[PDB]
Design brief:
Two copies of one chain form a homodimer.
Chain A lengths: L7 H7 L27 H27 L2 H70 L5 H23 L4 H42 L7 H35 L1 H8 L6 H8 L10 H23 L9 H24 L2 H43 L5
Helix pairs in contact in A: 1-6, 2-6, 3-4, 3-5, 3-10, 3-11, 4-9, 5-6, 6-11, 9-10
The complex binds a molecule of 3 linked components (NAG-NAG-BMA) (3 copies) and calcium ion (2 copies).
The site of one calcium ion (CA) has 3 residues of chain B, from helix 3.
Keywords (chain B): Calcium, Cell membrane, Chloride, Chloride channel, Disulfide bond, Glycoprotein, Ion channel, Ion transport, Membrane, Phosphoprotein, Transmembrane, Transmembrane helix, Transport, Ubl conjugation
Membrane topology (chain B): Multi-pass membrane protein
Subunit structure (chain B): Forms cis-homodimers in the presence of Ca(+2) and forms monomers and trans-dimers in the absence of Ca(2+). Interacts with NEDD4L.
Chain lengths: 395, 396
């Protein structure tokens, strides 16, 4: 039993000042689909574009100085490109693994909720068929014995009580129907993001290797187009840095205080106390369902005792009736078994473990991958800047 | 949803590789960590690695003597191969480190659940004992002028004895927890040292290559001679790394083919075979053998409550000062009752099976991939350093 605590790379990154456009201070509270927050992240993109423009201004200054008015730099550029590619590959793998763990946890939670709902529905149907079995049995088998009719009626009322107790439990249709869509969407987005960064890595490596191989054939016509591509790769790297910074700050925002956001998001389809119980599990919050399970088991035991007593006192009288009554016993047995499974799902240990696993997949692997991808972008930008600086010196 | 473990391609293919003793003998063994024959069979991979190292060195020295006794492209190729090798090795080391952490997490979770089960059983037994002593103290307070109350107390004592026996029917998890925690500590220690050693190897390779390049830029000083000398040292280190990676991958891949069989064979005395088969395999149609216990246990509790309920409805005018501890009885039962729910949550298979499917994904999906990528490291680093050593003495 452990509780999530935000690591250093989350709290420190959350400490980064948040600004809008006109030197305005905004609230560093996660709020997707907004305007004072969604546009707040665009400041990072503005800073990235400013840095890209400044870098190209300095490169143009160098070109003007070297036009109007060596192998060590190429070696440095190649080494920096290789280091950047390695760091980027590691970061991409880590941030893909984080989302894979997220999807796994969401699938597990969806399966548990579906199992709970199916068990409740099956128990309700079982009681509904118990009703008609009682009706058929008391139709004409028991006439003179008033006590037998009385105990059949008492069993029928107990069945009604069990039905009401089962209906007392919540319904998990909305949570499942949103978890499935969130899982599908995150898988889709993760696939495209991974493919895009893989293509970027391949393109960078190919360009650098072609540069190294073709610099030996004494500056053919490919050099000009290659140098032109050296600017599109730079703008791609800067855009990657902007995207990584925005995603990292968003994840830090929805990792500093995740339970507040989760509780605020869901307050209608399921109760607030249920959510607080599932998100916070300890031997102080006992259960909101303790009374319901207790009375369900009490009614089941009363039913079983009455059925046993009826069997012990009806073997000689109406021997052909047991064919129905024994079935009831089996039915109750099944119900009893289901109850155990139910108390294994209503316990919050499994769901809290799934929530902790999803949160670890978000805040411990996605953010590290984004940070390493930002380091990749910085190193690749530096290496390509060095390559473009050393290019025209040949001609 | 719920899934069953299936061996991936990199395990089924890696398991197929021949295992031949040390003298081309059919060792035909499945898995045996403590058996000397299996260790000798695994030593065949080390023998092959040493043979490969010797062949590579003899080929390199034959080439050297032929080209001596009778170009920056080679240096560039060596540097590029070294950088690619270092990157692949870092990724593989991180990946194989990220599996021995999930292993420890799963072991700790299972240990915590077993400890909770044992503590709950012990606490319930103690609660029944204090219930018995409370009945013993109370029986002297009320008198037998009513008669039925003494019979009710006798029935409560009998039910308490039945509850105690039912609790004693449940298994004990001391040996399992001790083995689990010792294995967790050992694997943490081993993986920490492995990671530290390989990180030091990466740093050494990078430093050697960079300072060798700088010395080459320094017109072949004695430093260059020192680097050509230690090229053989780092080559044999890389070959030993390949030996270790191949041996470990061959070793912990046969376990991944049938892990449940090995686990069940390891533990068959301290706990029953049915319990282990239930926890390892609980797919669709198992009865959860504890059920027949829990059910009757629950029954007894309810009976007790009903009795004490009556004892609170027909004893209000007969010595009300005696009702105080009676309310305590109810509280006692209440506590026991809620504990029972927790118990039926821990005895459920899916609580621990998901821990068995995580300690298995941390071995069969992350350790083996890391070992394979580290073997790729060893191959690439050996090739790069062989090229560097071949191109070295050309300057002299
Ligand atoms: C997440 O939970 C949702 C339910 O909230 C799942 O969606 C649907 O779940 C039902 C219930 O099992 C599936 O019905 C099944 O259809 C098969 C078709 O052959 C039938 O054989 C079964 O007896 C059952 O009736 C339904 O197919 C499923 N919908 C989809 C699109 O799969 C969902 O599967 C759960 N998992 C995920 C990853 O969303
Ligand atoms: C696996 O579970 C077992 C049982 O829960 C753990 O063993 C218990 O661990 C606790 C703390 O780790 C021990 O408490 C300590 O006791 C010493 C005195 O012996 C005291 O000086 C400390 O301040 C602390 O209270 C407890 O004694 C120990 N029980 C036994 C029977 O060894 C075990 O630590 C768990 N494994 C892991 C890796 O956590
Ligand atoms: C052991 O558990 C039982 C039930 O789980 C406790 O009985 C419940 O105790 C509460 C609070 O002590 C009482 O609620 C009362 O309900 C009546 C209606 O029956 C209402 O008029 C009162 O204003 C009050 O809310 C009541 O005794 C009982 N309630 C229910 C629904 O069962 C018992 O108290 C527990 N033992 C101890 C020592 O607390
Ligand atoms: Ca990882
Ligand atoms: Ca990984």
């Amino acid at each position: 039993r452990v509780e999530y605590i935000a690591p250093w790379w989350v709290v420190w990154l959350h400490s980064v000042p948040h600004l809008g456009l006109r030197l305005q201070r905004v609230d560093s509270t996660f709020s997707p689909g907004d305007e004072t927050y969604q546009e707040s992240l665009l400041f990072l993109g503005v800073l990235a574009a400013i840095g890209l423009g400044l870098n190209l201004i300095f490169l143009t200054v160098y070109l003007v100085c070297t036009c109007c008015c060596v192998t060590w730099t190429a070696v440095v550029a190649g080494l920096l490109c290789c280091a950047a590619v390695g760091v980027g590959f590691y970061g991409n793998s880590e941030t893909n693994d984080g989302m894979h763990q997220l999807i796994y946890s969401l699938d597990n939670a969806n399966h548990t909720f579906s199992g709970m709902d199916e068990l409740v529905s099956a128990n309700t149907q079982r009681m509904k068929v118990d009703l008609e079995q009682h009706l058929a049995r008391l139709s004409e088998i028991i006439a003179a014995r008033g006590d037998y009719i009385q105990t059949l009626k008492f069993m029928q009322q107990m069945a009604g009580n069990v039905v009401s107790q089962l209906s007392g439990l919540p319904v998990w249709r909305e949570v499942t129907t949103q978890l499935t869509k969130l899982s599908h969407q995150t898988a889709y987005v993760e696939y495209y993001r991974w493919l895009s960064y893989l293509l970027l890595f391949i393109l960078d490596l190919v360009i650098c290797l072609v540069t190294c191989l073709g610099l030996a054939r004494r500056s053919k016509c490919l050099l000009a187009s290659m140098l032109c591509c050296g600017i599109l790769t730079l703008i791609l790297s800067w855009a990657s840095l902007a995207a990584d910074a925005a995603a990292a700050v968003g994840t830090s925002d929805f990792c500093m205080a995740p339970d507040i956001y989760i509780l605020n998001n869901t307050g209608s389809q399921i109760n607030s106390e249920v959510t607080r119980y599932y998100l916070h599990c300890s031997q102080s919050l006992i259960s909101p369902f303790q009374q319901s399970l207790t009375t369900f088991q009490r009614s089941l035991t009363t039913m079983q005792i009455q059925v046993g007593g009826l069997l012990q006192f009806a073997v000689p009288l109406f021997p052909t009736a047991e064919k129905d009554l024994l079935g009831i016993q089996l039915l109750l047995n099944n119900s009893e078994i289901s109850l155990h499974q139910l108390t294994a799902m209503l316990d919050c240990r499994g769901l809290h473990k799934d929530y902790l696993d999803a949160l670890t997949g978000i805040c411990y692997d996605g953010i590290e991958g984004l940070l390493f991808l930002g380091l990749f972008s910085l190193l690749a930008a530096l290496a390509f800047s060095t390559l473009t600086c050393a290019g025209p010196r040949a001609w």
